[PDB]
Structures are given as C-alpha cells and as structure tokens.
Write a protein that binds this ligand. Structure first.
Ligand SMILES: Nc1ncnc2c1ncn2[C@@H]1O[C@H](COP(=O)(O)OP(=O)(O)O)[C@@H](O)[C@H]1O
Ligand SMILES: Nc1ncnc2c1ncn2[C@@H]1O[C@H](COP(=O)(O)OP(=O)(O)O)[C@@H](O)[C@H]1O
Ligand SMILES: [Zn+2]
Ligand SMILES: [Zn+2]
Lengths: 294, 294
C-alpha cells in the first residue's frame, strides 16, 4: 500500500508519499496560505499517486475527539482562514479514502515510537521547541487524548530571577512557550537563536527552562523516553544543560537511572531527525486504513 | 466473593472486607507502627473471613512496576522500617490468595472511576490534599503507570509574591506539596488548617496554589474529571477559589465548558467521600482475582 502524509504547519505544508514501515517515497513542500488554495495543492500533489489512505498531522490546538461534531478542525489559531475550517472533511471528500488525523507533535511521537528512540517501549513523550512548544505522548501504546490533546507548551514554569523578558505567548505571556520558544529567545536576546550559538548564557537559560518543564512532565506522566526536537534543539549544547538541571530540580525524589546516571539516554534527540512528524503521518494513515477495514 | 482491602497510610492502616461492587461489609483501623507488627494485625483481622483476593493501596512512592524485582515495596519514606520492606510479598505469603497493589491515591482514583464522579467516563484524575499531596490518573480506563506512578504533588508551581513561607517539603521545599499540604498551611499560618476556616486569605492562597497545579495537569494530561479529596478539601470553600482561578490562569486557551462555564462539575469532591481509597482497594482485589484466573 502507498500512503500519503500531510504535516500541516503554520508556515509550510509538507506532503509525502510512503509506506507503512515509515519509508518516504517522495515529498513536496509549499508555503501555508489560505486553506482552500493550500489544500488544493495537497490534492494536486497526491493526484499523481494511487494512495490507500492519508494521515494529517496538524498545527493545533485541534479538535482530535473523533466523537465531536468539529473533529478534524483547528480550534485556535491566529492564522487567517484556518480556525474551524473543515480540514479533515475536505481531504476525505476529495480523496475518497481513509484519512487519519492528529496534532503534528502527536505524529512525531508516533514516528519515534514505531521507528525511533522509543521503538520497543510502550510509552514516550515527543516535545518540539521551535516557533511554539508542543508535545505528544504515547501511553500503553496509544496516543494520549483526554478532554483535549495535550498543550504542554503552555504550562507556567518558574521564571529565572535574572530574566527580565516578559514573554512571547499571546495568551499567557511567560508560560514555557513564552519563555523558551525560538521566537522568545530572539525577542529576549535580540538575534535569532541560531546566531546566538556562541553565547553560553542563552543556552543555560534555555536549558533551565526546558529542565523545569521536563521535571513537571516526569512527575505527572512519567514517560519511559523523552524526545526533544524542533529548530531550537538543533543547538545540541542545550542537552548538556538539561542533563545537569533535571536532577537538581528533582533532588533525588524518584530513584530511577533514567533521571540520574543514565539521563543522557532518557532525554534524547529524535532518531528520525527532523522527519519524525512526516513519518508519523504515514503511521496515522496506516491506522486509518486498518480502522476502515475493521 | 468477599474481597479484602488494605489502605496503608503513614499514620494509620485501614483494612476492610467488601464486594466487587464496592460495598463495604466490615472495617477496622489501627495505627501504623513497624511493618512486621502492623502487617500481623492485618493478617489477624482478615483471619475471621474467607477472602478470595486482597488489594493494597499504599503510601508511596512505591515500586508499582509488576516486572520489577522490588515490585510491591515502598521505595521512599522517612517512616522507620517501611522503605524496601517486602510488603506485597509478605501479604501474598500469609494469605495465599491473589493480591493487588497500587498507590493509595491510585486506589481512590479507581473508586471514583467505577463508583463515583467518573463513573461512565474513560479518564479521571484523583488528587488528595492532606499530610502530603498525591494523585492517581485513569487513562483509557487503566491506571497511568509509566516509568513510575505519578508524583504530581511535587511539581514546582509559582509562589505567590506575598507568601513568605519557605515550604514544607524535605526534598524540594516549595513544590506544590511544600506550599499547599495540610502541614504547610499549619506551618505558614501557625494553626492547624481546620482552625483557620474563618480566615479567608488562607483559602484564597490555597485555592491559588491548587488552581496553578490543576492548570498544569489539564495541559499535560487533560483528564475528563478532576476529583479533589483529603483533609484540607474538607474546607469546601476552597473549591470556589479554584473555580475562579483556573480560568484566569488558562486565559481561554482551551475552549471546553469543563474549563469555564461548567468548571464546577469538572473539579469536584469525591462522590464516595473519604472512602474512595478503601473502596478502590476492593477494585484492586477484584482485578487481582480476575488476573489470576486469566
Ligand atoms: N538551527 C537552529 N538553531 C537555533 N534556533 C533555530 C534553528 N533553526 C531554527 N531555529 C529557531 O526555531 C524556530 C523555528 O522552529 P522550527 O522547528 O524550525 O519550525 P516550526 O516550529 O515553525 O515548524 C525559530 O524561532 C527559529 O529562529
Ligand atoms: N477538616 C479539615 N480541614 C482542614 N484541614 C484538615 C482537616 N482535617 C484534616 N486537616 C489537615 O489535613 C492534614 C491531614 O490529611 P488527611 O487527608 O486527613 O490525612 P492523611 O493525608 O495523613 O491521610 C493535616 O495537616 C490536617 O491538619
Ligand atoms: Zn502560553
Ligand atoms: Zn516536594
């Protein structure tokens, strides 16, 4: 079976064709514009191929409750045209094959869970740190989907007492995303994050904030592997700060090697690199195919 | 089938006999002392009855990984004799019937999930606020058990800027438990919490801290019902503060009635009152019985 994947982002769309084992056969990308024109490009790209199912990993928040009238829509976004657009249903109507749906970060979690750092485990957490901060979690082999999908980027961690930055988040100001996203780093220090790579205090601070968030996730969810991706995490030096800070914050409370001596194999970059998300959309496609047949 | 339950606490043990539908037939309690003598009382109480299975809901942290060599032990505690005592195995050796094991707060979650405020849902979160703070979560109808059971009481929420109290927690100082447990309230204000019922600012502050914790849990786990029990939550006025503060902290980020207009039916006291835990131990017993037969 050939499967289609759509990783829908605020800035670009990535579409791919691939197989259930996560092999990417072909891909394309294009800028995100209004939904009708953007989706028409998707349909035109897939028109070349004979696909059995598609999966969509979308920027959110989204309505990921399959029982909901608004399932398969983006529920909050400043991007023009996208909130409440019938994203999933338009792709189902055009393509006439099964279509899976999830957040983009859920897709990345599935990619690492099946083919990456969590292969063989029954739990993991994938976090991206880029334009925003978001996370997807697998619990007992299934994506975590409660009242909502998680919005773990918006938790309120403690400000560093020397950090004077007010925060980037339009909703909360200095939530984790507001303090530690790519744009927050840029707004705080006055240059883009990639151009601050030689300024240690930038990454100390970023590592401190990420470590505070991870301690909360460890105490609440206790995932068996934590995978950190996104633009900001291309600054690999951040990991060393995280590994120093997490044990200080937890202060020996939970006696596991993952959280102390072997933390460097617990909190890791994605095995699939920057492709975890798009590969995960193929998993969503395969799931949707199997569910239709059942 | 008659089932036995053991709710093991730091101060007292509660033992009960009951049925799979959560009916309590009989109960006894006694102070927690050293483990051999305490467990001998358990065995002597159950000796009267013909039981098919037992469930243990223990104060933790515990090792709740069934594949672990140290499964069914308490892994951290200042109480003399308890850390690493073979609690589960001693009860299995003496009783010679199936024995279930979990944290005490996991038991309370099961009680409310089957017989209480979450009956009919597939997700919930039970939090106790007493001598410590702890929580158990049900996800897709099963207790959440990752690398560890959750230790949600120890997350680091933001101090109120006018609160000068250093915090009660021996590990973290001013983690949620350190700021908002019963003993923290007493140490901060100089009287026991029950004797401060007429001092509004005590409960404003407590509501503010609990609300901050709940916002984090909502963003990370997104449970479909939040149940708040424990000694401190006998001060029912705390709920009204929580209902005012949660929406301010979230600032309309997640559009669900549970988090706004209908928050008073989302964050609730236990339907089972102070018996959620002991009833939950009967559910652990029934589970252990069924698992043996399978
Ligand atoms: N190599 C890098 N090092 C540090 N920051 C980066 C790097 N690449 C991108 N960024 C920053 O990360 C953010 C973009 O995140 P990214 O994961 O690339 O995309 P998006 O989150 O929009 O899908 C921007 O703030 C950008 O400046
Ligand atoms: N009715 C009450 N109102 C406020 N605080 C209470 C009340 N009862 C007990 N407390 C406080 O809660 C803590 C005890 O918690 P509780 O849930 O009764 O027991 P435990 O956590 O030890 O099982 C103590 O700090 C106690 O002073
Ligand atoms: Zn935010
Ligand atoms: Zn603590």
């Amino acid at each position: 079976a050939m499967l289609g994947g759509i990783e829908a982002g605020g800035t670009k769309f990535v579409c791919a064709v691939g197989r259930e084992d996560g092999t990417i056969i072909d891909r394309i990308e294009f800028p995100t514009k209004m939904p009708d024109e953007t989706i028409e490009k998707v349909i035109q790209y897939f028109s070349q191929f004979s696909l059995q199912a598609i999966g969509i990993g979308s920027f959110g928040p989204v309505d990921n409750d399959k029982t909901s009238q608004t399932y398969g829509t983006i529920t909050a976004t400043p991007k023009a045209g996208w909130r409440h657009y019938p994203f999933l249903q338009t792709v189902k109507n055009e393509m006439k094959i099964p279509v899976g749906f999830s957040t983009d970060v859920n897709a990345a979690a599935l990619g690492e869970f099946l083919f990456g750092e969590a292969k063989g485990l029954d739990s993991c957490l994938y976090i991206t740190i880029g334009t925003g901060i978001g996370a997807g979690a697998i619990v007992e082999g299934r994506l975590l989907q409660g009242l909502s999908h998680p919005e773990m980027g918006h938790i309120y961690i403690r400000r560093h007492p020397d950090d004077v930055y007010q925060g980037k988040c339009p909703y909360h100001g200095d939530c984790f995303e507001g303090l530690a996203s790519g744009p927050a780093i840029e707004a705080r220090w006055g240059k883009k994050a990639a151009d601050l790579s030689d300024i240690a205090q930038v990454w100390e601070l970023e590592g401190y904030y990420i470590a505070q968030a991870l301690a909360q996730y460890i105490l609440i969810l206790a995932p068996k592997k934590i995978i950190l991706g996104g633009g900001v995490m291309q600054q690999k030096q951040v990991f060393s700060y995280i590994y120093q800070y997490v044990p200080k914050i937890m202060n020996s409370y939970l006696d596991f090697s993952e959280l102390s001596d072997d933390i460097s194999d617990y909190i890791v970059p994605p095995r699939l690199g920057s492709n975890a998300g798009i590969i995960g959309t193929l998993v969503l496609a395969h799931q949707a195919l199997q569910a239709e047949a059942a």
